[PDB]
């Protein structure tokens, strides 16, 4: 029933419009804003703990918006609460990564961080260039597809509503909603990207999105070894809860 597909699509697009940390309008105005050399130096001078704490806050900030995104999606809130929790815990960062592509400049490889765009050298103090490089390469590759806001909305929702997450009690229900989302997205893609493979190319990036996020979890686990106190007493409570 196209009627249902359309309503589901509109609801997700509406939710996305109302729940990104940065609206398209704000992004357009923040377009030409890269950190100054002094600001970049400042970032590189921060301790590893200090920068990690800053990164943890920014990520948590973005994750909180993904939670709002999910709550405004009718089909999501119809899933039993247990699965809602599982989808969010396993997919919040993946959605943030997809959304991050909206705030990534593929010409000079810079990402919006704390109000301005900065290259990967901005994260030097993390001592995790492999993680950063992987995050940037994905963003750069997703940006090459030139997705519209509607496509990003629908795709980010498909990433979130994944019937493959382990421990789901009612996977089939998640699968059913995700199929309606993918079918909606496939049609939207026709409006833009003439000559595609686009949906298939997007779907093929799913495992990559997950690899970047697992790498994040790994880098974090080691950080917890070196600085346990900073994690349990300084990082945002939600960040600790989701990745510990």
């Amino acid at each position: 029933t196209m009627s249902e597909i359309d309503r589901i699509a509109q609801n997700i697009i509406k939710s996305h419009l109302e729940t990104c940390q940065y609206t398209m309008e704000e992004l357009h105005q923040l377009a030409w804003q890269t950190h100054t050399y002094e600001e970049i130096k400042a970032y590189q001078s921060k301790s590893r703990e200090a920068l990690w704490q800053q990164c943890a806050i920014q990520i948590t900030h973005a994750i909180q918006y993904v939670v709002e995104f999910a709550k405004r999606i009718t089909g999501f809130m119809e899933l039993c609460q247990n699965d809602q929790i599982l989808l969010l815990k396993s997919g919040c960062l993946e959605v943030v990564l997809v959304r991050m592509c909206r705030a990534f400049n593929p010409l000079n490889n810079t990402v919006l961080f704390e109000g301005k765009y900065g290259g990967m050298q901005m994260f030097k103090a993390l001592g995790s260039d492999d993680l950063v490089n992987e995050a940037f390469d994905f963003a750069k590759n997703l940006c090459s597809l030139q997705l519209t806001e509607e496509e990003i909305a629908l795709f980010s929702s498909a990433v979130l509503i994944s019937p493959d997450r382990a421990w789901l009690l009612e996977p089939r229900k998640v699968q059913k909603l995700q199929e309606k989302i993918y079918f909606a997205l496939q049609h939207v893609i026709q409006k833009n990207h003439l000559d595609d493979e686009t949906l298939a190319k997007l779907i093929a990036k799913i495992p990559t999105i997950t690899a970047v996020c697992n790498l994040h979890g790994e880098k974090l686990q080691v950080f917890k070894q070196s600085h346990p106190d900073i994690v349990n007493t300084l990082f945002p409570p939600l960040y600790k809860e989701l990745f510990n």
Binding site: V67, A70, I85
Partner: peptide
């Protein structure tokens, strides 16, 4: 997941 649980119901 006390926190995530709280946010979902806020």
């Amino acid at each position: 997941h006390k926190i995530l649980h709280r946010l979902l119901q806020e």
